[PDB]
Design an enzyme around this catalytic site. Sequence first.
Site, PDB file in Angstrom:
ATOM      1  N   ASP E 767      44.977  40.140  43.166  1.00 57.75           N
ATOM      2  CA  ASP E 767      45.668  38.927  42.694  1.00 57.75           C
ATOM      3  C   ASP E 767      45.137  37.728  42.603  1.00 57.75           C
ATOM      4  OD1 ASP E 767      48.075  40.616  43.166  1.00 57.75           O
ATOM      5  OD2 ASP E 767      47.936  40.742  45.412  1.00 57.75           O
ATOM      6  N   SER E 768      43.956  37.840  42.450  1.00 60.31           N
ATOM      7  CA  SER E 768      43.126  36.387  42.134  1.00 60.31           C
ATOM      8  C   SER E 768      43.165  36.168  40.811  1.00 60.31           C
ATOM      9  CB  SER E 768      41.487  36.686  42.764  1.00 60.31           C
ATOM     10  OG  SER E 768      40.926  35.838  42.674  1.00 60.31           O
TER      11      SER E 768
END
Lengths: 64, 79, 114, 48, 1136, 144
Positions: E767-768
């Site tokens: 989720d970066s």
Amino acid sequence: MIIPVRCFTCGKIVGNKWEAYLGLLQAEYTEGDALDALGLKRYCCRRMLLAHVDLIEKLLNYAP
Amino acid sequence: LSTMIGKGTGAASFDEFGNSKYQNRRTMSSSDRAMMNAFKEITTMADRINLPRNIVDRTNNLFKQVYEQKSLKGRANDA
Amino acid sequence: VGIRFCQECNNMLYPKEDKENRILLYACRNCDYQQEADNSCIYVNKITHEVDELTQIIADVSQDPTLPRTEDHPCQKCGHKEAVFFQSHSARAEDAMRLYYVCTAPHCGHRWTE
Amino acid sequence: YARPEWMIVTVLPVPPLSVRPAVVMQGSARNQDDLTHKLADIVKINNQ
Amino acid sequence: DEITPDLWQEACWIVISSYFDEKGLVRQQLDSFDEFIQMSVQRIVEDAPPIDLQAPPRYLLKFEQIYLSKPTHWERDGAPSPMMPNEARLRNLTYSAPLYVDITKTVIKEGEEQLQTQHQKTFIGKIPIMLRSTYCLLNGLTDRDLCELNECPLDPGGYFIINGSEKVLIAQEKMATNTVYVFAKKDSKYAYTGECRSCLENSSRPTSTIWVSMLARGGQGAKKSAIGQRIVATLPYIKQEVPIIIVFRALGFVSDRDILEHIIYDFEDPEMMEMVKPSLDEAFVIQEQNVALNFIGSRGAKPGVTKEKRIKYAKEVLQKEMLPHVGVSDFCETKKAYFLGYMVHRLLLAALGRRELDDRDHYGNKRLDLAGPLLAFLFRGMFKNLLKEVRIYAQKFIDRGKDFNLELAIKTRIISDGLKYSLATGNWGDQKKAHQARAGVSQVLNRLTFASTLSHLRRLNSPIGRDGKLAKPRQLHNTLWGMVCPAETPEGHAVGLVKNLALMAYISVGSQPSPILEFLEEWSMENLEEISPAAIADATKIFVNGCWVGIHKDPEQLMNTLRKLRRQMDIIVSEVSMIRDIREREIRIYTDAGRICRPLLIVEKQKLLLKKRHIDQLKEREYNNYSWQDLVASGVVEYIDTLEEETVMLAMTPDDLQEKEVAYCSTYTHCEIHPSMILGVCASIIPFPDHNQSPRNTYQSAMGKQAMGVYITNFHVRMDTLAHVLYYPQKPLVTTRSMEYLRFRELPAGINSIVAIASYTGYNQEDSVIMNRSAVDRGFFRSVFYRSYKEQESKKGFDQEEVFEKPTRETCQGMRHAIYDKLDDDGLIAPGVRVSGDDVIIGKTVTLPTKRDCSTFLRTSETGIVDQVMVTLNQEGYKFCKIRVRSVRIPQIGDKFASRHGQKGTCGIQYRQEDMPFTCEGITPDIIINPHAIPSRMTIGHLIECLQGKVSANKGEIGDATPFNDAVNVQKISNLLSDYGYHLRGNEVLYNGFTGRKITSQIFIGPTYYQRLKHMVDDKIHSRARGPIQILNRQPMEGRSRDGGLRFGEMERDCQIAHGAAQFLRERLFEASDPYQVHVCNLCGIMAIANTRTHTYECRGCRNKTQISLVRMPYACKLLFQELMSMSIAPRMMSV
Amino acid sequence: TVINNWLLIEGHTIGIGDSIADSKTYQDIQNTIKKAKQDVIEVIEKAHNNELEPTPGNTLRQTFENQVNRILNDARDKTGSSAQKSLSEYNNFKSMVVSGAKGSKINISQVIAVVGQQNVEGKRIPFGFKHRTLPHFIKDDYGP
Ligand SMILES: [Zn+2]
Ligand SMILES: [Zn+2]
Ligand SMILES: [Zn+2]
Ligand SMILES: [Zn+2]
């Protein structure tokens, strides 16, 4: 608030096209046609004007 | 500085016949009680003519000095 | 099974027997009134209580727009093709998936189970 | 270490100030602790 | 003529366009407040009994009319002037309107002479005014006028400004009153419990609840088992349950037949008769009304000294305290007996299984208390207090024999402060009685984003306390359809408890049921007091606002007549609910407020009453006077509440469900205007939300509230504590029809970004996000952070005062290592001055009883430029200064960014344009997200938006992503994309920016609307290294703003124990938190007195000073032992 | 480090094209669903006609739900399996599932074939309304 000076993706200058873009639409141009008339071929630039909201006009309504 | 007893919750809090056995007691000093009433009166008068709170604060300070100085002890507090 | 009230003070009448006549009687507590018992049954307890749901159904349900309507189950009384069907949805049944049909024809509240 | 009579409160211990410190907020107006507030009631009633 | 399916899509959104053009989005807020001011305030004042004084002369006071003026402010000189909402915000004033009342004073002097005088427009306090309401200054002002007043036209109002704080009253959800509900408690001693929360008309003295319960069969006994289950009633002000039959006896019904006639309407049913037999036996002893009354009085609130008092008290409770909504008069015994029997009858049906138990989660059984009902409740108490002190003040003067000045008797603080305090703090009720006061009712309006602002004004609060845990109230009940957003709900302890209204959902403001009752009497409805109990069995009971008014023998005709009247708006207003329970032979009519309803298209004979002519008239909405209200008047669209929805057969769309097809439902009563309206404000901005996993939609709903943008047009004038402004907000390339009504185009909260879903360098994993450094250098997602500091100099005390000035290190006592040079001679920094951490913006000095320093220090992390320095007088009249500091936030690594599909992610790294991968056209993605975020989350709408966005940008047309639109398909979008020289699936050949080599896999890339979230790393980064400590515990402070230390909680303590790191655990818990030293007597483990200066250590109690041991222990342990000593405990530390 | 730099060459994405299936696959999924609809209808008719014999240890209502859930569960599994077969070796959804990096076969089936039954407290959607789930359905509607 104001049209960005450059296209965020490629950096193409788009701050001199908003008034022309508005004029073309006033001339019954479709949004796609107006963008084509302005030379914005990459959809990254077409995004810049097609989705721009000129809130600065509303801001000018308020007295300084 | 003091604490007020809260309202009863269980049966143990209430006396044999209804009334709560633990009742708040008036432990306020007479001088403070009169002064408290005067400030309440001061605020009431100010609201009638919509005076700002800062004036009320100045008025409350003035009364405390007058009340403590006790030169007007013979006159009514409201006056 | 039936319930009676004394004609004197309109209170609940409870069963009672008289040894002299050995005949069931219904006597009111707060009234001393007595009545001859004709049912002879004090009460009946229905553990299964298979009460006919058709009696519980109300003919007015045919006016419900949300109930499904079927034309394949004509009314047995008036022959009307359209009919409204539904499930009991009554507790204590322990099982209920059968359909209860009510005739949609006005003034004919016929009800039946297929 | 424990006598049954000691379970009866004859003399009430007063916590040190550090146990019940007053907090400074919104000017130089000390706000006393709850224990300090309670101690006043105890001191007043027993004196009464 | 008729709307064809090919034109239905345009037609319905025209209908929706009219609805919002008229109603707006905060209508429930404004309408509720309007009703309170216009009706409730007058009603409360009128309903107040005249004040009678007698102590001889007799004085009477009556309050005739209520007058309200414009929101007015009084200058220190006493000159009134209209109070503009902007002025209140800046000067921290309360937006309130003066309240005046006409009072008539008539005095009887026993001389047969009456003197009457009227004190016209007597000021009695100030009422806070909801913004943009009928009584607001902004009311009736054109958009141009609002601009002249520094007010945003797009601002919906609906909130209060208390001391300059914009406050919004959250709709409080509660169970509907006056309605009989039967519930079964598995654990309780009662098998079933029928309750009814009865409240007076117009919401008089608070609701009184009565419980009718059937005892459980758990109790085992020869007598208990044989009789069965008995019914008892829990009347208010009664300690113990009362048998039901006794209550009926107290009402005046002694004979069993009479009582059973009110409970059982068909004696032919034997099963129900047997149920009441045990109850009859229980009350067999009591056979008289007076005996029954005495029995109830015995359990009264206060013990009865004598029987007469007991009977009188018992009659008092039954007369008014029991079923007050049924009646409060002495002739209402028969009415209450029927209703009480109905409650018993309802309980018997539940016990017999003939009627399903009521569902608490059903919102047909729920009411939403808006500001109107909320404020009215407060005003009733304040006005009663106002009259109470008026009576008290007049009593003193009349007792002395002198007449009293009416003006001096009125204490205006009672209403002005009472209203202000409740809104100011949110504690609902009285400040003295805050223990029972409802909290969280009033909240500061959220101005993070316009959608966030809109959502806060449409929020719903569930009755269940947040601390308590229960899934059922948190569940998405079926009755939420069309009324509440199924996706918008907070994550955490508040899941399912805090809700938001559906897009068209409307809350009934309430009205008088008198016109309906009068029509019912005119119609062939038999009064309850005139009929015999035998006739009830066949007839259908008629309930109006929960009161059984009578019975009707032709329910079908009556319902059709009632429906016709409401559609024609003749006698029945639109917001009146008419529910016919065909199976239960009951017709329920509801007219009160708090009922949630939505507009639905009426269907007759499988045909919409809405025809092309209505659409054409709406098309010319302006210069035609044709509006949404005309549709309601025309009878083609009507409002339907939750209760009436149960009886409604509804069609999702007319194009498909109305058309002839496989026979499923040939009897449709209504139709949706559009299925997408079930979504709320925040859920309405999700594109293709029907293609995403439901949890993602909820996540975006929360995320959208935190998206930066332009929360309001006039933000420059405003001085808010926090405000985030995006330089270049963009309207989404792919939008939804609903977005037009949210003003999202006017106030966008994101930028359309070229997003490539690829695994480039591993810096977007988990989720970066990888951002384009060059794009950011061009203003991409660049934002402003505005922070306002307010400081007030107030003089209070004999010689203590506060002033604005530059505190000299010598003159002032208090001082800090910060910089005081920036301050001007007046103690205020100047605009345009760069300010960093540990900088003084306000120089405040308080005179020492020379002077202490109370100067304001800029936030350590903050580094901005003084934007505005406003100086004025606050609501208290003291000099008031607000300073706005402007700091520019360029997107950095760690800044949170999310799509409109719940795919939030911080910036993992920023690459320059050359480093970013590029297409054959030289296009580099603005953002790169990990492909692994999509599969598990199943945010398919995210991919569709990217594909549609690509078509929109190339085609030049804003894409439509309305959820339930068959006209839009992925294949359709793919086909359009092929027309523009791109892969039909949105894939493109990308070249490695580092090497220029074609990537083996073609990358899914296209324009996607992302939003910068309020959470910025620079606002969260915090470090502590021997900072300040708190006084009580002498441990590191708490909070990032206080340079506090991170908590090493028990779990961390437990973790290190498993690690076996004893010393580090000691370091964290002893050395790094509060290392302390104490002296302890060796004989007794009590701490000894230590005088290091004198090197004398003594133990008072042991009479020894030679054997004292120094002990190193945490200060908290010292505090614990000392605190334990306060409880007489003796924790004796022994070193041997 | 080594494979991350190699990924700069091979690359890895996920898009709409990976979410598509062959029209033959769509027909198979549609046919399986349509068959499931009839199968549930057949069971409903058996229950309506009292032709359903309760399974030992379960009530008639429990037996009806067990059969309905079994039919729909089997249909979901069959449809999910059909979608998985249609996926090519280049499919990125399959790429992240075979590797185990993220997702599962259920995720692929839901994205492609059918989301499946929605359950509350382990049961199908309850009749929150009077004998129906929503106002758009007739009463006593036990269909999927
Ligand atoms: Zn460009
Ligand atoms: Zn009798
Ligand atoms: Zn028939
Ligand atoms: Zn010692």
